[PDB]
């Protein structure tokens, strides 16, 4: 249905170990398609998905130039942030930024994003209007005033509504056979006794794309939210994802439990039970 293009930037200072490393990765939905790393022997924007490889030299050259400039910009931002927080030169600090755009099924812009964090804490974000900022504290208000004086929100709005959505639509077309293909989970329920009194039922979902999925256990038709152990959805390494959910059940009561699976690739939601 809906799709997103997002870039994830991480810059980390390392006093005494050279200049801060800059890494940028680009994703369409759950699929990484580009990377750049300033610590590479020869830093360059590099393809990470097959469908992006057909872009010509201008694409790789311009993205490399942009990322090399960003490496320098982020180092200056880290110097400024250290001063805004009165921090010493001795410590390592992290600047992260995410930006990009979401489109609906018809390719129309749903919304844009530009948000930053310092040391893992939200710092400043472009509001959904693409015209104003939300600053976390008085340090971020310094950045907000600088960006208001320089009309940065207007620059972001032009990029997000223009280049970003145009290129997301282009990627979705070039990668349509994967980016617009939902692969359903393969599912099964396992049973493992814990003692004479209890057993674990575990409901598995394997091989699905995209990562969004709903996996729940019900007992007599009631959701078992507090009693379910639900692992984080995890990458298989072949584009797909995996997840499981487990409940501890009294011996002999297994047929009262049902596992429910919802995913975009399924013709119909699934209801699974342990099949002894």
């Amino acid at each position: 249905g809906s799709h997103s293009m997002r870039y994830f930037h991480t810059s980390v200072s390392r006093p005494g170990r050279g200049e801060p490393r800059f890494i940028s990765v680009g994703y369409v939905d759950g699929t990484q398609f580009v990377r750049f790393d300033s610590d590479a022997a020869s830093p360059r924007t590099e393809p990470r998905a097959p469908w992006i490889e057909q872009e010509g030299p201008e694409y790789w050259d311009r993205n490399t130039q942009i990322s090399k400039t960003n490496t320098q910009t982020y180092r200056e931002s880290l110097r400024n942030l250290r001063g805004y927080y009165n921090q010493s030169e001795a410590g390592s600090h992290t600047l992260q930024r995410m930006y990009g755009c979401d489109v609906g099924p018809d390719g129309r812009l749903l919304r844009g994003h530009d948000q930053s964090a310092y040391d893992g804490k939200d710092y400043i974000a472009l509001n959904e209007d693409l015209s104003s900022w939300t600053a976390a504290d008085t340090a971020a208000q310094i950045t907000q005033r600088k960006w208001e004086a320089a009309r940065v929100a207007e620059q972001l709005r032009a990029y997000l509504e223009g280049t970003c959505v145009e290129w997301l639509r282009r990627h979705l077309e070039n990668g349509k056979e994967t980016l617009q293909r939902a692969d359903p989970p393969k599912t099964h329920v396992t049973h493992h006794p814990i003692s004479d009194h209890e057993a674990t039922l575990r409901c598995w979902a394997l091989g699905f794309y995209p990562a969004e999925i709903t996996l729940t256990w019900q007992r007599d038709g009631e959701d078992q939210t507090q009693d379910t152990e639900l692992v984080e959805t995890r990458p298989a390494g072949d584009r797909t994802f995996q997840k499981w959910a487990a409940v501890v059940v009294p011996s002999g009561e297994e047929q009262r439990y049902t596992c429910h699976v919802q995913h975009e690739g399924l013709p119909k939601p699934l209801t699974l039970r342990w099949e002894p």
Binding site: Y7, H9, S24, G26, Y59, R62, N63, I66, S67, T69, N70, T73, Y74, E76, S77, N80, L81, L95, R97, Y99, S116, Y123, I124, T143, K146, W147, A150, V152, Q155, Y159, T163, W167
Partner: peptide, 8 residues
């Protein structure tokens, strides 16, 4: 394309 980000 990416964009050139603004200094904080």
């Amino acid at each position: 394309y990416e964009r050139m980000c603004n200094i904080l």
